[PDB]
Write a protein that binds this ligand. Structure first.
Ligand SMILES: Cc1ncc(COP(=O)(O)O)c(C)c1O
Ligand SMILES: Cc1ncc(COP(=O)(O)O)c(C)c1O
Ligand SMILES: Cc1ncc(COP(=O)(O)O)c(C)c1O
Ligand SMILES: Cc1ncc(COP(=O)(O)O)c(C)c1O
Lengths: 342, 344, 342, 343
């Protein structure tokens, strides 16, 4: 019995595990200076069609927090959404890594920032009493399962230029957004004005690690020193970089993302039209956000269905992963149908 | 006439009591960093004034004083609960987060510039999971940034909640004087008798050149605070010039005379104008500021001899602020021009 | 093949690979709340013979830096040796993690602090101009391959208690110290007064991760929040904790350490009676420190041997790992004889 | 008779500072630097240093140096200082707090002074990611042991800093004493010799509170006002930090107070360095006299009513003269040294 709590509970996929076994034969130089790390970096430059600089941190909390700290001073501020992971789920790590850059929440719409909600935040305060906004962060796919599209990104970068702002992307679930859309990685990042991407691996079948991709190379000066000082330098770096070889060499990363997307779409197809069940947001990645009644405690007691419930408390989230079985999706949907109609 | 506007009580000068104390203190050589007669003398007056054995420190300004006090009350992986209009949130260029190394400021709902036990509980109970920094402090401002005052009963309620939730309670008393004068309470009744643990007591705004007193009523919380301040660049070499002015202000009641004056000036203005049509007082005048909804005639009062004052990022709302040295006649001139303008 | 630069270049030992394989069957709850993490902590508790609090971080730099930041405030100081890793190899990580606690170097005989060298540094500075010392960190085995003995530790501990200092152990090479002396782990830590131990895993055959053991559970208050904010919290904690189960269940940790020690003791035995070659320190762990003449170049770059050279001209350090073959040792000692004799 | 030789930090507010504060206390004026006194001070600083330097005020020298160093490199970079540097010995770890972890690396010093060689020693042995990369050099002028960098010593440090990509900061807590002694222009002791940033002490030379921070390289001062604000170092009532500089700078008073304090230290040392068992530990190039003495110094200390800073214990004794030091009291102190040792 697997569950729908989160894609952090999934295991290592076979291509990641296979890269790791290959990387475990021999001795190799530490701290980045190895063949596996240069191969993964080469793959990243080709995938994104650019000479991006590539770094590897241990988890997404540190990767986001480092990236942002490199994009502005402690006396500047960072514009994010209200559901942003850097605002809700990192126990104040950005502020620790930045030595006090304020996160200013902007209004959002479908989990997404807009040009107007940014400007409303930035321009309310170019006075020294306020840390001057200098960075926008967006999550792709968002924390509520939605996806910024290329033109929405460009509109946001446009505001970032009117206002002086760098643009960071938390791509913890970037794959899900690439699977969903036709796009190439480049059209979803630097072609649309993205300065830096944090590209999640852990959630897409890896044991540990995130990649950080600087598309403006002037912003990446000495980033390796920052990472070391912040305790984010793997000595046995191949075991962070090798799985990215596995996942990128013939498109497995994007297959695993389509799978997880298809499971969540299937779940929503099966349940979103029942009575008393409202889809909170369109299913554009691997999550399903349902308003339901006291049937959550029934779906919860009635078999250990494991899933997250909001403090909104008339609301539940189901997350699908690369290793989710369609049959389990149908079984979950069936139990939801039973519990509502009966 | 005249240099004196209605923009900020931070444009006022050094009052005579503060100046006279600095001059006396400028007679001889004394030892540094707190080990002088003036600093001990000032601490005595604070203990006497607050009726308790509070520990006393001096910093250079309110931003550091608040930022130091809050950092001493919880870890970087804990959070601070404040109002949406708290100076620590709006006016300190992120100093609290710098001084604490990353304590998140969590804003709670405000009724009349004030937090309630309810708004504190709501923020606090949503964040027991490790994804959020755990709340460990509530900060309140007295008088508040919209010129309202918390009453001892309002404070006791907050203090109970903080004690139920394991929260320390910090008071930003940049305008503490204005709240004591208005209510007529004792300082002790507006701080530790209602459960305040640490008070930042502003001097600058009420007639000093520089300097803010930090008072720890809960002395477990003050261990090594002097090292914290030193490392933070907040230790005066010539400490007598921070502490002597508090002897000036406290020996004979001048601090409250100056606060009552600024309050009475603010109250006058509101009396003179709050009955005119198209002029709403947004908040009771419980300290030294006046908050008026008016029409686009802000430019009218603004252009008219360049009354200087603050507008909000809001269209038709203005803030007039009085200090220890505001002349009542300037207030009368201002209220007059406000009336002329609205009746024309 | 394999070199003598650092025990950081070695791979994942078999007991640890196996544990990760078993831990990769199924889904598990995140951020520490899994059976592997509980099992690992139980092994530590039995192994050290005490109810110690157990945490996992990603590497030794963060682990040390985290433990030390938890033992004193930013306006306090830490007493460490001049060769301490926290002073030389961490790109200022301790100061970053502690928000500015000063590291005060005390004098070392044989890579080791003494009660006297601690006292000198601590009493010199009881005035506010100086951050007040509040922690002693020692390294076990030390950075020069020596080992503190239970009696030396107890002595250092008596000083710490008298001066109100906490005692931290950087045990990046703790296995080597235990293998060598034959003591119980308890006898080299809490029975001798150690408050906190950073227990190296990466160096003894893991891909990633260190264990942090608090022997005073009150000092561990909220360490989990500290680690989370610092970006040191694994989402898939089982892949940091299961390898510890593998290394500890049947005694592999200590076997792997005796191996690395024996190879290093062999290398020194083979070359010690040579004329131009002097052993700078007793071989008490897995490193050999040799003063020989700048004909280290004929060993080095020349025949392709890899090893670190001390900032002393012709100061070479040779490091043996869990997977060092005795034949490569006998080879290295043979080439050293050719270059010296002829 | 409260007049001692422990520290020029115990001195009072001088008349030119006091009179300037008095003039500034007439009216209302806008806060946080937007002020007639702050602009006048800045113009005096620019004329005095013969250049278009950007001017800031902070509350004290610990913060002034810590802020200046923090703007000159990143937390994962390092600062090269001397073994006697105030930032290393006297600031309770403030540099590291303000920079969020920049390592202070000490370099070998002779007579309180860094040299191009000792800087180079440190900077070139710290070249891989294990070590925070050096990015700044700080020097103190006058130094912590009462000596002075000569313009030519400063040019040579600057040349080494330019070659190594290092910025150059100057802790001028006692800058007045160095200018008074050497007869150089301020420009010749700062930016003509390569200095990027000066912290110019006012408190030690007759003010109540405050330091000036001068950026000669204007690019390095970007957003420095925001850094100061976040660090708790922005005066609401800025006129009371900047007006005393108007008083000190408008007609020479700063140097006159520096020469007085140096001449008083020169007299003290003149009158006693010929006694036996009494030795000057360093040249008297500012307002300090460092004397190696006999433990019986305790009788100068003792019940003689003399305060001064005993070294580690008991060898050294350090004496410091101030703008308000009385020559007579110097002659007294030297006479009481004279007796005690003449028996
Ligand atoms: C949207 C988002 N960003 C970043 C992270 C950080 O992920 P982690 O620290 O578990 O690798 C998560 C969990 C996430 O959901
Ligand atoms: C409510 C409140 N708290 C603190 C401060 C900080 O004062 P300062 O300008 O002296 O840093 C102010 C201005 C304030 O209005
Ligand atoms: C003695 C010592 N302690 C701690 C560490 C930190 O190890 P890591 O390289 O895994 O950050 C090392 C490398 C070390 O040699
Ligand atoms: C050489 C030096 N630099 C900086 C300072 C800091 O001065 P303050 O005590 O005003 O913080 C002092 C006292 C000093 O002697």
């Amino acid at each position: 019995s697997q569950q729908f709590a989160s894609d952090n509970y999934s295991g290592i996929c076979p291509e990641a595990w296979a890269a790791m076994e290959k990387a475990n034969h021999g001795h190799d130089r530490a701290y980045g200076d190895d063949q596996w790390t240069e191969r993964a970096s080469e793959y990243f430059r080709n995938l994104f069609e650019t000479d991006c600089e590539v770094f590897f941190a241990f988890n997404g909390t540190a990767a986001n927090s480092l990236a942002l700290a490199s994009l502005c001073q402690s006396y500047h501020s960072v514009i994010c959404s209200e559901t942003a992971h850097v605002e809700t789920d990192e126990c104040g790590a950005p502020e620790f890594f930045s030595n006090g850059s304020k996160l200013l929440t902007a209004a959002s719409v479908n989990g997404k920032l807009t040009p107007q909600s940014i400007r409303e935040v930035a321009l309310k305060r170019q006075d020294i009493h306020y840390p001057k906004p200098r960075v926008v962060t967006i999550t792709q796919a968002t924390e509520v399962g939605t996806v910024y599209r290329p033109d929405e990104l460009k509109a946001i970068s446009a505001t970032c230029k009117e206002l002086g702002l760098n643009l960071h992307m938390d791509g913890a679930r970037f794959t899900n957004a690439c699977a969903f859309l036709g796009c190439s990685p480049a059209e979803l990042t630097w072609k649309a004005g993205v300065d830096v991407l944090c590209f999640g691996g852990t959630k897409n079948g890896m044991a540990v690690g995130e990649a950080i991709l600087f598309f403006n190379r002037q912003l990446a000066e000495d980033f390796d020193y920052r990472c070391k000082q912040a305790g984010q330098l793997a000595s046995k770096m191949r075991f962070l970089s090798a799985p990215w070889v596995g996942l990128l060499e013939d498109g497995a990363w994007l297959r695993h993302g389509n799978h997880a997307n298809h499971c969540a779409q299937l779940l929503a197809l099966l349940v979103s039209d029942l009575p008393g069940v409202e889809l909170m947001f369109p299913v554009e990645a691997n999550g399903v956000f349902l308003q339901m009644p006291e049937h959550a405690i029934e779906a919860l007691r009635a078999k250990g269905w494991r899933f997250y419930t909001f403090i909104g408390s008339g609301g539940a989230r189901f997350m699908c992963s690369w290793d989710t079985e369609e049959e389990r999706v149908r079984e979950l949907a069936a139990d939801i149908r039973s519990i509502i109609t009966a």
